[PDB]
Ligand binder design. Structure first.
Ligand SMILES: [Zn+2]
Length: 429
């Protein structure tokens, strides 16, 4: 099985699970960032992250809303903050790992890798440095930092970007390329998030008997906030991500404003899952699945043509990676040795990735209260000291029996659990 590593932010670099990395993507970082290996190819860099030039973490001057936002330029600024964040992420992975589906989710994300290449990679080549799949490992000597090598994370979890309550997962590419995450190859994903900042709602999946009266507000369990993003990472890793331009015009209401229109991305619909998937026209769902199958066929063709690798040191390991990728995509190997795509196996895999590994399904499996739909109306966000086992533990999250909060999800009920507190109102927008 899989085990989650434990760390203190202050723990020494060991050139194995603790290193200093330069992703060449964080506009907030002027020097290498300390990183920790949660397990396998999943790493965490407990720092704020940004993709905007001349970044600013202060509340925006203009109007970016209705989108609910929380801005605090000092969140995660100190080493003390980073240590707490790091431990929160670790604890959440342990809870995710407590159920079989979560163990499988972590196993896949930490074991399978992006195909080494993109649309512009020659068919006979394995490129382990394509786009942003490899990150520099740096060490200090003197008053500077020098590259000593690189690693290939599959997923890097970082702290929030500008808006602390808008978790986001992304892949990156060079200007002249297209997104490999949408073309079968898959690519490295960066998840920017802070699970302890919980979204609140009243339109929930589990009936608690208040239908005819006043319904309680509940918080989202931090593991679902994180697992939701891990679903985007799954789509990105297996190269089946749906372009962000694929949407359905909808409405919802933020923490302040009233019902406003929004373009609901199909990527969000799949990450959430459940009946919501039906919002995507059946013909469109089939279209993207068939498109993915064609990209997979192209990958199988590449696997039958590999003769060189970049960097050259990987040439002697072409067979090893060919086998790893064959297992990832669940391809079949003919007696002749040719790699072929089995439709039955593909359909099963695609279904798993888009309809089984979903937030909606996790809520049922982990037995926690959760929003009924991705666009459930939200209220003021809440937070809690999730590192305190008297507040949140691995087995039951907030719904702890010892606290007498295990009945009807009372642990997640804002008016029944004093451990839950509204976030600072000042940073809210
Ligand atoms: Zn999402």
């Amino acid at each position: 099985p899989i085990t989650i590593n434990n760390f203190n932010y202050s723990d020494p670099v060991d050139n194995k699970n603790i290193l200093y990395l330069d992703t060449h993507l964080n506009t907030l970082a002027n020097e290498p960032e300390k990183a920790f290996r949660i397990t396998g190819n999943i790493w965490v860099i407990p720092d704020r992250f940004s993709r905007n030039s001349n970044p600013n973490l202060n509340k925006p001057p203009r109007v970016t809303s209705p989108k609910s936002g929380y801005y605090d330029p000092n969140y995660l600024s100190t080493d003390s903050d980073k240590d707490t964040f790091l431990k929160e992420i670790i604890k959440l992975f342990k809870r995710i790992n407590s159920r079989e589906i979560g163990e499988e989710l972590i196993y896949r994300l930490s074991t399978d890798i992006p195909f080494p290449g993109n649309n512009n990679t020659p068919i006979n080549t394995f490129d382990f440095d394509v786009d942003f799949n490899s990150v520099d490992v740096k060490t200090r000597q003197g008053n500077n930092w020098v590259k000593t090598g690189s690693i290939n994370p599959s997923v890097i979890i970082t702290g929030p970007r500008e808006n602390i309550i808008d978790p986001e997962t992304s892949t990156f590419k060079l200007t002249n390329n297209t997104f490999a995450a949408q073309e079968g190859f898959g690519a490295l994903s960066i998840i920017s998030i802070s699970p302890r900042f919980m979204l609140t709602y009243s339109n929930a999946t589990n009936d608690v008997g208040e239908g005819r009266f006043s319904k309680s507000e509940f918080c989202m369990d931090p593991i679902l906030i994180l697992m939701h993003e891990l679903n985007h990472a799954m789509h990105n890793l297996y190269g089946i991500a749906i372009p962000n331009d694929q949407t359905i015009s909808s409405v919802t209401s933020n923490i302040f404003y009233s019902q406003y229109n929004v373009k609901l991305e199909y990527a969000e619909i799949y990450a959430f899952g459940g009946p919501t998937i039906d919002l995507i026209p059946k013909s469109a769902r089939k279209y993207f699945e068939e498109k993915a199958l064609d990209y997979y066929r192209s990958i199988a063709k590449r696997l039958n043509s590999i003769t060189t690798a970049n960097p050259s040191s990987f040439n002697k390991y072409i067979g090893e990676y060919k086998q790893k990728l064959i297992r990832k995509y669940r391809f079949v190997v003919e007696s002749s040795g040719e790699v072929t795509v089995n439709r039955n196996k593909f359909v099963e895999l695609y279904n798993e990735l888009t309809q089984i590994f979903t937030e909606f399904n996790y809520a049922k499996i982990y037995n926690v209260q959760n929003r009924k739909i991705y666009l459930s109306n939200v209220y003021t966000p809440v937070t809690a000291n999730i590192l305190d086992d008297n507040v949140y533990d691995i087995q039951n999250g907030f719904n702890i029996p010892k606290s007498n909060l295990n009945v009807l999800f009372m642990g997640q009920n804002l008016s029944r659990n004093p451990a839950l507190r509204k976030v600072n109102p000042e940073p809210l927008v």
